[PDB]
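Hi W.,

Here's what went into the run:
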Amino acid sequence: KVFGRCELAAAMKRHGLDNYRGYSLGNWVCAAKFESNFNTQATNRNTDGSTDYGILQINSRWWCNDGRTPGSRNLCNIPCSALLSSDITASVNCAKKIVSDGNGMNAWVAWRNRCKGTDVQAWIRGCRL
Amino acid sequence: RVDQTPRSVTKETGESLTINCVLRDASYALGSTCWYRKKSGEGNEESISKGGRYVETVNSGSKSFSLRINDLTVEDGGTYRCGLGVAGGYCDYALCSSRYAECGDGTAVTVN
Ligand SMILES: [Cl-]
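Here's what came out:
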């Protein structure tokens, strides 16, 4: 699924991301735009042979089990295929886990580069939430 | 950035080691902390279990975390590194090169 902007904002609000760990909803919408172009089915392979999966490009070396990784860390305790669904629940729940420790939203490098320091509220402007 | 001090130190057996880390340039709050050791030129890194000899002092306000190693012996020689944990305290030296954490530049410790 390729979400529309307001469609995603509304979905992420229902899923409890607004002000989660102090990050306003616009952060999450902007992050998804720049990570996945709003595409739930997005995958990107990395140099280390891991892959980033789904709307929030969550990495298989650390966060999900791809079923072919010896000693899979699988810190979100999910198959990576759960991250490739038009239903964003598993991606959101994994994102909540990630953001609650470590480097916060810096875990999404596209956020650091395209979102952090901008008027992220713009990403929910004109939306009915 | 995690600024780890000192870069090197020599100690005598029976002395204690203190390494200090401070997280700089971060908009986020200090989460879990991790400490790693590579016994001199062995060529593998390992997470240190906090406790006993290994006493951590954290100040989340100043985003500072420090390790004191007591009762040093020659076997404690090597390189030590501090870092941010993930997922509620998971530690692994490969986090140091990931998008998910930061680590200090390391301390080369010699014990006579
Ligand atoms: Cl790819």
